[PDB]
């Protein structure tokens, strides 16, 4: 017949190949298609939805739900820190298990900007201002508000609109960053400080809580599929 010669790679089984194969059930009639609501075509669509971030990981939380709320008090020194965290969406315990971190943990590289949304859940009569800042990578994280305000930041005024958005820009030397972030691909820090202080009238609770939401922007993307390290087994399930 037609002369041929086999090249390297013949008879190998590569788990990510694309080849045609015979059908074991010839002329099988499949069930007609139906347009079920809520079709998802790309995982970034899932990644772009907000999810509550457990910022309050203080190592002595006897109640798990306490992790989601950030405490706030009426009387505090003029400049004081509300919270601080590292911007490692796929590695930091804060973002590790969120709806965005779970998607990232299936991939090796990521790039793009992020949205952090903060919502004030105090009384309607309470008021205050907060300074939320993003500090790009450096040798030392900010220690005071004076330091924090030198980076990207927004002044948040609490009023009828209960929510404010800090958009973390994509500032990097490389087009992509590793999910298993190392010192070479650091991403910076995020901190929140009192701007004016929280004031309340008579007959209101003396403490309030804030919550944080994390999601990706429309320029976010991922690359290089890999297996997630969060799930494992020791024996075959039965």
């Amino acid at each position: 017949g037609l002369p041929t010669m086999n090249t390297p790679g013949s008879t190998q089984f590569l788990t990510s190949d694309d080849f045609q194969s015979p059908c074991a059930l010839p002329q099988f009639d499949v069930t007609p298609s139906m347009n079920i609501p809520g079709e998802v075509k790309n995982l970034m669509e899932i990644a772009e939805v907000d999810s509550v971030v457990p910022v309050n990981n203080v190592q002595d939380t006897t109640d798990q739900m306490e992790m989601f709320r950030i405490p706030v008090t009426i009387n505090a020194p003029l400049q004081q820190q509300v919270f601080g965290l590292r911007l490692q969406p796929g590695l930091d315990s804060v973002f590790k298990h969120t709806l965005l971190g779970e998607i990232l943990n299936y991939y090796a590289h990521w790039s793009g900007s992020m949205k952090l949304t903060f919502v004030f859940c105090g009384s309607a009569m309470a008021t205050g201002k907060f300074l939320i800042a993003y500090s790009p990578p450096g040798a030392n994280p900010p220690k005071t508000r004076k330091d924090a305000m030198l980076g990207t930041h927004i002044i948040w005024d609490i009023g009828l609109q209960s929510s404010c958005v800090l958009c973390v820009p994509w500032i990097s030397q490389t087009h992509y960053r590793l999910v298993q972030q190392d010192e070479y691909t650091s991403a910076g820090y995020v901190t929140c400080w009192y701007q004016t202080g929280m004031i309340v009238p008579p007959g209101t609770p003396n403490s309030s809580s804030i919550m944080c939401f994390a999601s990706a922007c429309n320029d976010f993307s991922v690359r290089m599929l890999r297996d997630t390290p969060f799930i494992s087994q020791d024996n075959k399930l039965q």
């Binding site: 007609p32 609501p37 509550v52 798990q64 779970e102 859940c121 009384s123 309607a124 609770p205």
Partner: protein, 251 residues
């Protein structure tokens, strides 16, 4: 003003004067089944106004120590007006829903609730293995309470709140159609759910289409007032309901 809403189904009306927008399922509005997707051959029955109307689903108390509640549909309406009768007498059913949750408090209270509709909310038992009857998670319109500590009774579901009874992070329920009730801003929440399933119709007694959950993320707090609790009420209205397969009643 866009903070006022009015909804009219059948011979019932809902008015809210301090509310957020309306969430519509996955962007799809409820509708009747088409001719090119049906499988059953006999003529459907469409009661219309007799069934598509608002029903008030009893009431509960929000305390400082509350953890959360859930309802399973359409079981929650199994004995409510003519909707229950049509459920009993027919083999197949299909309908969308409008869910309205009322909760009002003064300007001096604080707290936040998550209202979410979970399709196919399969739940696990308290003791791995074993089994539980269909009374540990649905007994009519009565609400079932989550638990702060891990459940121990083998006859009921694992009610640990932080896992939502499904083995998933409670904080990720934002992926489903949802809305928040924050006492500073709004006093109601409205969700329109289309019919979601893998088949055109299904038996309404055997299968739970979706589960409604109300979870306090920020616990209620107040000081120096005579109001000790904040009631929460749930109202539901089937939409575009139709049935098929008449037989003897019961199910």
């Amino acid at each position: 003003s866009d903070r006022v809403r009015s909804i009219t189904l059948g011979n019932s009306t809902i008015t809210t004067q301090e509310c957020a927008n309306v969430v519509v399922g996955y962007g799809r509005w409820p509708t009747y089944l088409r001719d090119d997707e049906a499988t059953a051959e006999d003529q459907p029955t469409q009661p219309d106004v007799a069934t598509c109307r608002f029903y008030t689903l009893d009431s509960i108390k929000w305390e400082k120590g509350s953890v959360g509640w859930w309802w399973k549909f359409p079981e929650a309406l199994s004995d409510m007006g003519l909707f229950g009768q049509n459920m009993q007498y027919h083999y197949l059913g299909r309908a969308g829903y409008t869910i309205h949750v009322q909760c009002n408090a003064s300007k001096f209270h604080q707290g936040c609730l998550l209202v979410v509709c979970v399709p196919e909310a399969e739940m696990g038992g308290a003791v791995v293995g074993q089994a539980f009857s269909a009374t540990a998670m649905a007994n009519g319109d009565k609400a079932y309470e989550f638990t702060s500590a891990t459940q121990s009774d083998q006859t009921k579901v694992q009610t640990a709140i932080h896992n939502a009874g499904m083995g998933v992070g409670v904080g990720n329920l934002t992926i489903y159609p949802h809305q928040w009730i924050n006492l500073r801003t709004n006093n109601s929440a409205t969700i329109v759910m289309p019919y979601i399933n893998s088949v055109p119709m299904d038996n309404m007694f055997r299968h739970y289409n979706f589960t409604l959950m109300v979870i306090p993320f920020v616990k209620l707090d107040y000081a120096d007032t005579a109001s000790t609790y904040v009631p929460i009420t749930v109202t539901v209205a089937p939409m575009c309901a139709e049935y098929n397969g008449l037989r003897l009643a019961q199910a």
